[PDB]
């Protein structure tokens, strides 16, 4: 099931019952969750800016007749982040570490909560979701979100998709700890079934060997 808008530029598609994911083009797609739960729409990360997050905001809460509580902001990137200002005018609580926290105003971005630690366990409603700071890698403050019901991990950009040959932006990155935050990933979280990329699309564990294999 792929629901997508008239333009093309925005799309979400069921990994399973309660779990979406969104896709915007910025033509470069980036990826991100729709927790569809019994008490409001969660997603992780927004869109590229205010005008596509708004956008997906929309999509979703008519699609699912529900508000958007809560976002993860995975890092402080315009795929990330590039809706921030549109997710505080509408209520929508945007959890972050405080090191994204300070990074985004640091990039001229409202900044987000700021809340979020080292290890942080999340419920709405019935879905269960972790948030991890593996360490730098893809960019200094990036985590990945774990649901624990699912076993999936969304890795973000520290996770690069199957046919990725490009590590992407490394002039924020921290290339040579990324491969040790990718082995902390690896050692906490033993069972994977699915894992998402920042950017392309959904795979297993394979595609955290992989990036580890470009990394070398
Ligand atoms: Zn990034």
Redesign the pocket.
């Known amino acids: 099931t792929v629901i997508k808008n008239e333009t093309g530029t925005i799309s979400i598609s069921q990994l399973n019952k309660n779990v979406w994911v969104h896709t915007e083009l910025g033509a470069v797609p980036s990826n991100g969750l729709v927790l569809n739960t019994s008490k409001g729409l969660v997603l992780v990360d927004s869109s590229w800016d205010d005008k596509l997050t708004k956008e997906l905001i929309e999509m979703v809460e008519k699609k699912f007749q529900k508000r958007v509580t809560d976002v993860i902001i995975t ?1 402080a ?1 315009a ?2 982040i590039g809706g921030i200002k549109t997710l505080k005018e509408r209520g929508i609580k945007a959890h972050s570490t405080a090191l994204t926290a300070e990074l985004a105003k640091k990039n001229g971005y409202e900044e987000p909560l700021g809340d979020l630690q080292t290890v942080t366990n999340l419920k709405f409603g019935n879905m269960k979701v972790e948030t991890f700071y593996p360490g730098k890698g ?2 200094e403050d990036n985590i990945v979100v774990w649901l624990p019901q699912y076993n999936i991990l969304v890795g973000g ?1 520290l996770v690069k998709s199957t046919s990725a040959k490009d590590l ?2 490394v002039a924020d990155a921290y290339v040579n700890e990324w491969s040790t935050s990718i082995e902390n990933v690896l050692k906490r979280y033993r069972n994977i079934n699915a894992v998402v990329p ?1 950017h392309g699309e959904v795979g297993d564990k394979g595609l955290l060997l992989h990036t580890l294999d470009l990394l070398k």
């Open positions: 890092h990137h795929d990330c893809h960019t950009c992407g932006n920042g």
